[PDB]
Amino acid sequence: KQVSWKLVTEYAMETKCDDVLLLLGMYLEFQYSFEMCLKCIKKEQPSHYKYHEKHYANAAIFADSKNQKTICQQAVDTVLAKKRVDSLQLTREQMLTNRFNDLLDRMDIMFGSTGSADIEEWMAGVAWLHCLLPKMDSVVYDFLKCMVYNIPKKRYWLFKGPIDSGKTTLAAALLELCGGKALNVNLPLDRLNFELGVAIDQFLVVFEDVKGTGGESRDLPSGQGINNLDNLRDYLDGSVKVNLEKKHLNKRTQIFPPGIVTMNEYSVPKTLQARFVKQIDFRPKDYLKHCLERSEFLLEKRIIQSGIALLLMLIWYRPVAEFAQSIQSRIVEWKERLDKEFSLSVYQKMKFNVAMGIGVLD
Amino acid sequence: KQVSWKLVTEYAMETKCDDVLLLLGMYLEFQYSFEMCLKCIKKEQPSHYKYHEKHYANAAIFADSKNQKTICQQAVDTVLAKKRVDSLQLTREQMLTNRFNDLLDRMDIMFGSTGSADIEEWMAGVAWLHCLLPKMDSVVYDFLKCMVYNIPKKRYWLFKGPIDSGKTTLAAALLELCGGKALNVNLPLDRLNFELGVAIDQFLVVFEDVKGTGGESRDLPSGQGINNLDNLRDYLDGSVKVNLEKKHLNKRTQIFPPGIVTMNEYSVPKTLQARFVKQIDFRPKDYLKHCLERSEFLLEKRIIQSGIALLLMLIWYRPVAEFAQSIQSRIVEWKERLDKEFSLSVYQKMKFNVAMGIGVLD
Amino acid sequence: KQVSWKLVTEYAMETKCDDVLLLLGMYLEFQYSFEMCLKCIKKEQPSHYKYHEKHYANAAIFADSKNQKTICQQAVDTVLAKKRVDSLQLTREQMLTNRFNDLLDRMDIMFGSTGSADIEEWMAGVAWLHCLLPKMDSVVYDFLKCMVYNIPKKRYWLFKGPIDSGKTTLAAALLELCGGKALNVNLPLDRLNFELGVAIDQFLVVFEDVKGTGGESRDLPSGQGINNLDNLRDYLDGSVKVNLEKKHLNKRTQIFPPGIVTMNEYSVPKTLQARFVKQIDFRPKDYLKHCLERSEFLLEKRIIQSGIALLLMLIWYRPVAEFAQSIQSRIVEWKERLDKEFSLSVYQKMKFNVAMGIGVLD
Amino acid sequence: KQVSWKLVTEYAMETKCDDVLLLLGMYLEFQYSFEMCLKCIKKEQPSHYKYHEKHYANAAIFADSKNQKTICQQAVDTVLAKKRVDSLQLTREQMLTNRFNDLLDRMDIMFGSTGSADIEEWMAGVAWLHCLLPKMDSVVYDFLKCMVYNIPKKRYWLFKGPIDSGKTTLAAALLELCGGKALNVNLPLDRLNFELGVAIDQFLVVFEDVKGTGGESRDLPSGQGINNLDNLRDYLDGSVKVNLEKKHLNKRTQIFPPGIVTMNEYSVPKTLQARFVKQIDFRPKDYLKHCLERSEFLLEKRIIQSGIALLLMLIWYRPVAEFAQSIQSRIVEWKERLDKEFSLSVYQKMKFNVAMGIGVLD
Amino acid sequence: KQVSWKLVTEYAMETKCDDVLLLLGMYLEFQYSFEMCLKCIKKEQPSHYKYHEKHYANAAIFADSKNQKTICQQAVDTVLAKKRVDSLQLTREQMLTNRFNDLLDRMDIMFGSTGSADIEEWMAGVAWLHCLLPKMDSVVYDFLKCMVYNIPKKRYWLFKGPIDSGKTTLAAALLELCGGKALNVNLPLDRLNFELGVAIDQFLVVFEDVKGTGGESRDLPSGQGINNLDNLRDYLDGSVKVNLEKKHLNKRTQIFPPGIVTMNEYSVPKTLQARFVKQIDFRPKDYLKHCLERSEFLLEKRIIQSGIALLLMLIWYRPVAEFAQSIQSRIVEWKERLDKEFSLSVYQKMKFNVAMGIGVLD
DNA sequence: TTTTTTTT
Ligand SMILES: Nc1ncnc2c1ncn2[C@@H]1O[C@H](COP(=O)(O)OP(=O)(O)OP(=O)(O)O)[C@@H](O)[C@H]1O
Ligand SMILES: Nc1ncnc2c1ncn2[C@@H]1O[C@H](COP(=O)(O)OP(=O)(O)OP(=O)(O)O)[C@@H](O)[C@H]1O
Ligand SMILES: Nc1ncnc2c1ncn2[C@@H]1O[C@H](COP(=O)(O)OP(=O)(O)OP(=O)(O)O)[C@@H](O)[C@H]1O
Ligand SMILES: Nc1ncnc2c1ncn2[C@@H]1O[C@H](COP(=O)(O)OP(=O)(O)OP(=O)(O)O)[C@@H](O)[C@H]1O
Ligand SMILES: Nc1ncnc2c1ncn2[C@@H]1O[C@H](COP(=O)(O)OP(=O)(O)OP(=O)(O)O)[C@@H](O)[C@H]1O
């Protein structure tokens, strides 16, 4: 009596499993009677307890199979195929819509019955970020627009200033909010090439700490990143398809994603300055350090650097119409939950404390 | 019963699907009821809704097979094999009739019953393009007819210029018309020594931001590309078929295609100048800016860099003589529409709006 | 009759074996008569003598199989798939309890009656360690927390002190305790690429004896590791994911582990100094050397380097509540076993002997 | 009722096809009815229409095969094995026989129906070259059979005479006639080894101007290269095998190819001239360059540079009995196919004009 | 009937044949009748003639098989599998005990009836080596024990002396006796990575002729090696695990083997001298030289190079009780053989002859 | 067979 490969593939679709080993490992767990399944009884992993009962019968047969890896290979290929179909057909708006659904699914789990996330801690993060710069949530919408529109030769925002001024914290939150990857340009010119190959089929990329020259003027270590980025003008323009690469692999050719670049305050040629649509300078604020010192759950749980903290900020501050028709359904049930559990007085007390440099919770 | 690999390959042929994962995914969609199919109901994707009903039955049999990737591989290979036999045996003129049939089949969709964009906008593009430089449209025909009739030096162009001067947009439009690839050769000798190999069965090639070591009198970003391209004489000359590099796949030796160099305003040795049909020496013009600033619909839709933007100009300016007889059936019939949809006052008014720096539309 | 692949997969899981040849070679041993198996009779290897009697029947048929390596490969994949599942789903604290349970299992054999250690010698090692620094056991707890919490920019401790002052000894013990890798960054920048690849999915890392520059007056040889560390800030900070690499294998994206830097008495740029959480100064002290030269079994058995000794220190010193919940049952039993076998007076006698520089035992 | 693997191999042998995708692509076309096959109707391509009618029956069965690429791989293997077996046996005349045919095949297209080569201006170059130096058809015939005989010590030619005396041009033209490559010597000795490796299995090789010391006062670039050359007594005299080397690969040994050294009016130690069959001195003579200045089409169409111009000279001067014994038939076809076009008188007309310095044609 | 894969695997185990091709070739020789087989008849190779008659029947079927290399692969895998088990499980004493059995098996053949060696001449080897240093036999026993215990710090021995003073001769015999590798550390610092890579999994290592600074003060050449050893302290002390690399392979980690260092009499940095357990001085001695002139058979048969000679010395000189217990039975038989073959009278005259510098034998 | 090594 044979294995249903169809049931296996369906699990890999429903749980969007990218890895043969991950798929293999988790399907094996279903061989034990879900009846007795300690993990299900303790509700610890949705990708398991949502499925164990349905897949149990098939898993017992799969446990005996001699073909196992081949069964998994066909499954993962199907998920990969689905991604390429999507990537070659979705609008960037629809792509962003899908990412928001993924994050909302995580939020529903985080604050769910399992409930491990304290939404009080998470909302403190929103206050801190809204405090960091003026008009914060409006600036986020402007970033989201230009990432969606992907307007050629107006594609990159420059984050600049002194150290410990939060630029990477915001960048990491933005990069979790979208999809994307960090990349490092501060490399010898031969090394860059498999490296920039990583950007294949990503939605954002972030370049870090790109080293200027003559920086000792500023007590900055001079280095390559800026002079390398000069040679990348074609990629930054996004004005025509570039070629990308991997080991043992042929190239793929595509427009290069949009993104963000971070800078200690080196000088830059204006020939390059022309190629950024916008620039933001970050500057230190004594009271924020005090606040974090009092409130280290903000750091220890990484809340301030999470895309989930940005998403909550947007849900709080933006109109419902700023979200696509499909997700407005879920935006509705989230806006109410925040309000139902943070009266404006609560958030005011928080945002007050942040500005005061007081420990946020009291 | 059992999968018809024949029907698979017929889909792959008729959709020209070169990609095994793309093909795998696309064909798997057909497993569901076409009579239900929401994509067919939307008429969302041509390469779906044309075919779903026909392949539905075969896809259900495919949906349970265990050979799935192997089935796709054979089918895809006939696509490549056809493409390569065709590449070898067809005249470059016949190739253009093929390429032009392709673009017409897209235009057939773009202004199909969906009216998915308004042709007024694309024609505002034609005005914004043709107005750029003397006799603009004619240059397209001259360039194209060089790309068929290959001759030494009479194979390559310099698009020299300053910042913000259209050369890239021109080039991008030309490539999206013709089919081909772009390249960077500011990148070093070894990278160049592989990347020259991109030319397999391509009709045309273009080069990007190519910087020469001089030009600090114009403070240019400066580099090796001048020396490299100068040194890349066989590829330039095309006087014999040359090796084209590949990784883990069959390399080949072919006539190196014709193409264009874009470069900034470097100093150039007169011998290095003595290599072309012609230089085109790009310059800025003021009205363009103000037009676009109003006409911002152009760029989210990427009209002015599209290939089909050119073809509308070409249709606009050229006599019916300027086309092959097989396409003349389509071309003439299609050329009718422009009068139905534009009195010439429209085009006049648009180009005047362009000239006056207004939003092109009124 | 036929081979049970399932029993092989069980054995691989039960022994947690990863190497296909180790698994193969092991399984083959069961083919001989269990009732005459000299290894079983001699009770030498538990991974043999627990299992031969059970597996014997299937091992005879395996010994005849024409397919032996494919059977083993599927079994190894099952074990590796478990590691993958764990790496994604477990918390850092859970990983640490798994490691502790494995070490506790290793301890239970060594100090079993069928074991081979002397618990008095292994306890003697603890006395030497608790003299090596002030409040040694508290420092271990504070370090363990630091690695479990993994707080960005607060992730690395610096060990410095003259040569022959125990820093490498202590790192090797913590490294065995947690699992991890040592790394050497006194390299040219190219090879350093693959060297940092070794960190992949490790819990800790230890950078070994990085070399500063200048200080021939310090009488330290100069090198370049510290200039390299100053580049690698991003890897220390753990703020954002980064891409690791292996020979002939694709780039792997993860956040980089927390860890330790060890260093002789070089000067350190304030930048790197600001980037370490804590600095521990080791010093050479005579009575340790004199005691150690009288207590050489401490060296001979590697007692002083080995993580088992640190775990024993925590069991002795720390409250039971400081251990994760489920292991408290086992930890309580070990505390009782230690108390059964050592008075406080024995431990006090040992520490006083160490202070006197006499041999620890008396 | 089954695919004959045999017939597929035959077609691969007759096409001498070395590519599995091409062979796949080609053979699939035979599946349609040969009876109406429009390529068979149009008769554009004999490599199709010769075969379709025979293969059609088998091609239908092939088009239904699920194994197609495997059939085709075996077919290409056969042709590669065939070429390898043959390649191990060649006389140098069989080499020259094979390498001749390429030019004829190309001419059969260049001046064929595609006809993009003007045979007149091509023959104008042939006439032009005739007066560069004495009796050049015999000079080349004497040179060339020496390259077949390859008799030790009797294998190398030296060009002398001042800048702009034509030696670079004629050398490169002969290199085109022959294949092979040229090499430098003007390097510190270690560099030479991999460059010498280029000679591996070349039919012929060349050496560029030797930067001869004993050129200083002559104001020629001057230094080691002549003394470097003097150290390679062995290779040139070509009695015995020698080692050769390449980047990233192990050594090989061969009898080094025969060849040419090309030089200006330097010094020469007798030690080196002792190694030569023939000195030739080159004179700049004004009617040559001034005719070219009056005939510069030769430069653009690369005519005099071309190896086909050299073979054309031989074809038109030399007696049929001198060419490769069987191919003489084909040579007579080409002679006839040219004789009808050009008399001695028109060729002599050209010769008069060049000798007078007048532009070649009238 | 069919190939028994088991009988092949049994041959591979008993010949300990590690290489698939060697296993393949060996087994095919059994095709022919052992009854006539000249290799059997002449007793040329025990790995043949001990086995031909048993394996003959299976070899006949093997020679018709179509799977031949597959059978060899699984057979060889069994051999490798046995090593991997043994490497991780055995004690250093058992490893040496196994190594002794192998050498004794050779001696059983070598001094057998077919045995081509003279036990008399090989006993001259023992006489010469027992002359080379005071208490030679005791030195060997202490060295071996030191390797077996592998006590950290106390791991390494230093040989010093003039050229042609014997240090390499003794290193070579020790290295054969134990198994191990010779390494060169006079390299530049970069290449050292792969050189140390050779130490992977060895039992001993020998470092060859490490050159010091400034030994030109007594005509010695000079180089890096001593400075490099002043780097690698932990490799010598052997307290801590270290990473090791091979070309194209990911690093592995282990304790670095114990071993020997050899040098001419440079000065030694006392940092390095503190590493070594013991220094042995080699000094040239005329009577050894003069005796060696008249005992050429020692050199010509490489007697004094070989581990076999040392094992004979240990058998003669050490008590039976002094070996690991499983070997002691064989020792008694070899003791009995040797005491029959020589009176103390004869042996002591030979030592006297070496002191005479006369030929050993009379 | 590339990529790693080797080349540099
Ligand atoms: N505006 C600010 N004023 C004061 N402290 C700040 C500010 N922004 C961030 N911080 C502190 O700086 C720490 C580091 O933040 P972050 O990494 O985002 O800074 P950065 O300037 O982007 O640094 P880098 O260039 O090193 O990546 C934060 O954890 C926070 O404690
Ligand atoms: N002729 C022009 N005059 C003024 N601005 C222009 C002109 N052509 C292009 N630009 C500006 O440059 C933008 C990018 O166009 P494009 O890439 O074609 O120009 P380019 O000269 O090739 O650019 P680059 O200097 O980056 O190579 C346009 O959207 C427009 O804003
Ligand atoms: N505090 C100490 N006082 C005296 N001797 C010490 C002390 N710590 C270590 N030792 C001695 O130093 C030896 C080497 O220890 P270890 O390798 O850990 O030292 P280290 O200073 O960290 O060395 P390195 O800097 O070379 O890594 C120990 O085996 C012991 O003999
Ligand atoms: N026989 C000739 N008579 C007159 N001019 C000549 C002759 N041959 C070559 N030229 C001139 O010499 C120029 C360079 O030709 P070529 O490189 O073949 O000569 P060369 O003697 O090898 O030169 P050089 O030693 O300077 O590199 C030609 O462009 C032409 O102007
Ligand atoms: N102690 C000795 N007295 C005299 N001659 C010796 C002595 N040892 C070796 N020889 C002679 O020197 C030759 C080389 O011996 P060996 O290679 O062991 O010397 P070495 O000093 O270790 O050399 P190297 O330092 O070059 O490795 C021997 O074959 C023998 O002829």
Side-chain angles (χ1 to χ4, degrees), chain C residues 132 162 164-169 264 283-285 288 292, chain E residues 233:
Chain C
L132 176 60
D164 292 339
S165 192
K167 42 199 186 306
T168 291
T169 296
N264 281 277
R283 298 187 181 282
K285 302 189 189 179
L288 295 173
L292 184 60
Chain E
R233 188 170 89 120

Side-chain angles (χ1 to χ4, degrees), chain A residues 132 162-169 209 264 283-285 288-289 292 299, chain C residues 153:
Chain A
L132 179 65
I163 63 172
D164 280 0
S165 194
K167 48 192 189 299
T168 296
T169 299
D209 306 345
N264 290 337
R283 295 183 61 266
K285 283 172 166 182
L288 300 184
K289 298 190 176 184
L292 285 170
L299 284 157
Chain C
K153 303 194 70 167

Side-chain angles (χ1 to χ4, degrees), chain D residues 128 132 161-170 209 264 283-286 288-289 292:
Chain D
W128 180 91
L132 171 60
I163 65 172
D164 310 317
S165 62
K167 51 193 184 294
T168 306
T169 302
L170 178 55
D209 210 340
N264 280 277
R283 291 300 90 206
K285 306 191 182 188
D286 293 344
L288 298 170
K289 50 175 173 180
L292 290 177

Side-chain angles (χ1 to χ4, degrees), chain E residues 128 132 161-170 208-209 262-264 282-286 288-289 292 299 304-305:
Chain E
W128 200 84
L132 183 62
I163 192 163
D164 292 355
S165 192
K167 47 194 185 304
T168 291
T169 302
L170 185 53
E208 295 288 24
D209 192 22
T262 62
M263 60 176 59
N264 211 324
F282 287 77
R283 300 185 191 158
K285 320 184 187 170
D286 289 349
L288 301 180
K289 172 183 175 181
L292 189 58
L299 289 177
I304 65 175
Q305 316 306 336

Side-chain angles (χ1 to χ4, degrees), chain C residues 307-319:
Chain C
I308 299 290
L310 288 179
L311 177 56
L312 284 169
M313 186 173 64
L314 293 172
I315 292 162
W316 187 255
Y317 277 81
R318 306 314 301 173

Side-chain angles (χ1 to χ4, degrees), chain D residues 325-342:
Chain D
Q325 71 199 34
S326 306
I327 315 308
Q328 296 185 4
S329 57
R330 192 176 184 193
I331 301 304
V332 170
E333 308 316 323
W334 272 92
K335 281 175 168 278
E336 162 47 25
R337 179 264 173 269
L338 185 68
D339 294 333
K340 186 169 184 180
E341 321 309 329
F342 304 94

Side-chain angles (χ1 to χ4, degrees), chain C residues 145-183:
Chain C
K145 273 187 173 183
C146 193
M147 305 298 99
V148 173
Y149 286 7
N150 190 24
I151 300 180
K153 303 194 70 167
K154 298 189 177 187
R155 308 178 69 230
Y156 270 91
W157 286 21
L158 174 63
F159 289 176
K160 77 184 308 191
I163 190 160
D164 292 339
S165 192
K167 42 199 186 306
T168 291
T169 296
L170 186 56
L174 294 165
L175 177 60
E176 179 168 30
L177 182 54
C178 293
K181 293 288 184 178
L183 300 171

